[PDB]
């Protein structure tokens, strides 16, 4: 008697925006923006972070006596540095090219501490000096990986030593220069005043002299230590020479892994969980192309965007029996998106048009996958350190990141809105196409009712309805009863 063409509706409250419309309820939707992390600092790729606790990188490498827990450090996946750490240069001072060193340590992971210039090789020098500022259990002490060479007997013979890098890999060497508060200190500790410190390799040629001056006291000391560093290439030799004010390394650091990592600023601790993408706020476990958790993320991560939601429609407008697509609302049809409602002598009921639904389905699936699969995910560390004398460079870096963030956010927002507009138009087109696909086959044997349904002039039984539904209706056989 009658066959209608219509579409699926359900109880969904999911909403999407489109270019032309806002707050459109749809039957199905896909959220492509990750919003939730787990609140924990996790092992990255199964490898724990280097937890410095209250130590800075300089404190760690020099051997600040309060960083003893870091004297032997296992391979790390990232470094967790507390912002504004306490244990750094206990004996007040400064560290040259510190930001470059922190950057160097990013692509490092494990390194081996190697003794290069054993403390007891320094005969004819006093190697027992220390300071209350670095005291351990009351007793004055010093950086543990460094030797403070001072006068012995009544002399300071030229201090010399060298090291040939036969360790198997490029090595990090740190040394420094003492800068006394006054002349009395300079003479008491080194005998001579007109001193210098000279260090070099096949590429390094650095010579400096102490700057004796009154300075504000820091940690009780009016003096300062200046530290610097180089990388000694494999098979090269580093020479040291001094007539005073030299703080020699005892140890160097052989880089062992040279992998890809970074330094995270965080006050937390390791929670013994695992991730592939770690932000300072917690780990992100997601397969989505975008996230909005935190920009300073270390790992293989989704793009960070400023958006709050990015939701693709995948379904039909959710528009809540004897009418077709014109009115919508077939909540009684749960077989597929597009279909038929037939009524005849044997009975009535809903059926999906499986060919139409599957094609529409595959189309939507491919569209969603294009949006997601075309996004390029790479390992990144993001954060960079700058000194207070590098503000133009720091700002350039910030501007670059803000620039890319606005580009990606804008594109994510419009890609979603433009695609949702096409998705809903696509589905409206597909139901209309069944209406006409069928109308063109039924031709003059039916009456168009104006509501998305066709009335048969001839009697149409369940075998007839099956024939109409899969497109095999035999027009000539039914040119009767009119």
């Amino acid at each position: 008697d009658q066959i209608c063409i219509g579409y699926h509706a359900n109880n969904s409250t999911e909403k999407v925006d489109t270019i032309l419309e806002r707050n459109v309820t749809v039957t199905h939707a896909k959220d492509i923006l990750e919003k939730t992390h787990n609140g924990k600092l996790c092992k990255l790729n199964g490898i724990p972070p280097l937890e410095l606790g209250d130590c800075s990188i300089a404190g760690w490498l020099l051997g600040n006596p309060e960083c003893d827990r870091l004297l032997s450090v296992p391979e790390w996946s990232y470094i967790m540095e507390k912002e504004n750490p306490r244990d750094g240069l206990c004996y007040p001072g400064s560290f040259n090219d510190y930001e470059e060193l922190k950057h160097l340590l990013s692509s490092v992971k494990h390194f081996e501490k190697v003794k290069i210039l054993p403390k007891d090789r320094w005969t004819q020098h006093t190697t027992t000096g220390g300071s209350r500022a670095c005291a351990v259990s009351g007793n004055p002490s010093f950086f543990r990986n460094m030797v403070w060479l001072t006068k012995k007997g009544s002399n300071y013979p030229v201090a010399k030593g060298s090291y040939n890098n036969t360790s198997g890999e490029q090595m990090l060497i740190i040394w420094g220069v003492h800068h006394p508060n006054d002349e009395t200190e300079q003479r008491t500790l080194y005998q001579n005043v007109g001193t210098y410190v000279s260090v070099g390799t096949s590429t390094l040629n650095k010579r400096s002299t102490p700057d004796i001056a009154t300075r504000p006291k820091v940690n009780g000391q009016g003096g300062r230590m200046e530290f610097s560093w180089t990388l000694l290439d494999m098979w090269d030799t580093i020479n040291f020479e001094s007539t005073g004010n030299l703080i020699a390394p005892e140890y160097g650091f052989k880089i062992s892994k040279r992998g890809s990592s970074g330094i995270m600023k965080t006050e937390g601790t390791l929670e013994n969980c695992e991730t592939k993408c770690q932000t300072p706020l917690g780990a992100i476990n997601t397969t989505l192309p975008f996230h909005n958790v935190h920009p300073l993320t270390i790992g293989e991560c989704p793009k960070y965007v400023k958006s709050e939601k990015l939701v693709l429609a995948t379904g039909l407008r959710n528009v809540p029996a004897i009418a077709g697509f014109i009115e919508g609302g077939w909540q009684g049809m749960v077989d597929g998106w597009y279909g038929y409602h037939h009524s005849n002598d044997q009975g009535s009921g809903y059926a999906a048009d499986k060919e139409s639904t599957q094609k529409a389905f595959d189309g939507i699936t491919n569209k969603v996958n294009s949006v997601i699969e075309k996004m390029n995910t790479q390992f990144e560390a993001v954060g960079k350190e700058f000194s207070n004398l590098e503000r133009r460079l720091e700002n350039l870096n910030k501007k670059m990141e803000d620039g890319f963030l606005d580009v990606w956010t804008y594109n994510a927002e419009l890609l979603v809105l433009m695609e949702n507009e096409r998705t809903l138009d696509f589905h409206d087109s597909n139901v209309k196409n069944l209406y006409d696909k069928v109308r063109m086959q039924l031709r003059d044997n039916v009456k168009e009712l104006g509501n998305g349904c066709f009335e048969f002039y001839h009697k149409c039984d369940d075998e007839c309805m099956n024939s109409v539904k899969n497109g095999t209706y035999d027009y000539p056989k039914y040119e009767e009863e009119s």
Partner: antibody, heavy 126, light 107 residues
Framework: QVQLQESGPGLVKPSATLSLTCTLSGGSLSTHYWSWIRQPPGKGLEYIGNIHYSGSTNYNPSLRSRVTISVGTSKNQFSLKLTSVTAADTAVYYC????????????????????WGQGTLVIVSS | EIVMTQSPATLSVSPGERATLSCRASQSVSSNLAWYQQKPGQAPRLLIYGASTRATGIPARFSGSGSGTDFTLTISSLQSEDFAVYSCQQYNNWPWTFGQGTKVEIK
């Protein structure tokens, strides 16, 4: 501050080893260099040498072949071993702490002794 | 070594009077010289170091100066507690050396 007390035999033979200890009270060795000083009757003072807690030492070049200074494990005592005593070694022996450079720096040379001890007179005879 | 010679061997300076003691080095000691006060029955006490820097616990009546080879110790007004044997120490060389001791006695 600390007090220092010398201890040991007041009698040594003309062909002998002399051995004296110094005990600290009110403190411990604490990164400072500790010294021995000798005063033969009728003479001024003679510096013998010192020792750091770590075992680093400095000896008067003229007595190197005959002198050992050591600490041990109590961390508040140190001692002097003088070999081949010829009795020219009769003297008052004193222990002293090398003055620290400053409240903040230690373990460095100064060359003046601030806490000294009464001393003990050792007679070498037979 | 550096020989430290003191003079006069003794002073007879009476209570209330200024007492001046001298020390002469065979080699320059820069400013690296200390003075000590020794008395029978007690440990020597440091009075001065660094040629002119007063040791703590020492009254202002004690002062001194000099450089190179020529140094002095001065007691601005000698008290009864200051009758002692005083000596100078050289610490600008190795070994460190001391003078023979100058006795202050009452006339």
């Amino acid at each position: 501050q600390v007090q220092l007390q010398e201890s040991g035999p007041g009698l040594v033979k003309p062909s002998a080893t002399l051995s004296l200890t110094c005990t600290l009270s009110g403190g411990s060795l604490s990164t400072h260099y500790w010294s021995w000083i000798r005063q033969p009757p009728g003479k001024g003072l003679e510096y013998i040498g010192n020792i750091h807690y770590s075992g680093s030492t400095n000896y008067n070049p003229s007595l190197r072949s005959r002198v050992t200074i050591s600490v041990g494990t109590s961390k508040n005592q140190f001692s002097l071993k003088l070999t081949s005593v010829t009795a020219a070694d009769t003297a008052v022996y004193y222990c002293a702490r090398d003055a620290p450079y400053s409240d903040f720096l230690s373990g460095v040379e100064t060359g003046w002794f601030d806490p000294w001890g009464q001393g003990t007179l050792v007679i070498v005879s037979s | 070594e550096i020989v430290m010679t003191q003079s006069p061997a003794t002073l007879s300076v009476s209570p209330g009077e200024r007492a001046t003691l001298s020390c002469r080095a065979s080699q320059s000691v820069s400013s690296n010289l200390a003075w000590y006060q020794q008395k029978p029955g007690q440990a020597p006490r440091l009075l001065i170091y660094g040629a002119s820097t007063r040791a703590t616990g020492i009254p202002a009546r004690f002062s001194g100066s000099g450089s190179g080879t020529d140094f002095t110790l001065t007691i601005s007004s000698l008290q009864s507690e200051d009758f002692a044997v005083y000596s100078c120490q050289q610490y600008n060389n190795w070994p460190w050396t001391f003078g023979q001791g100058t006795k202050v006695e009452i006339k």
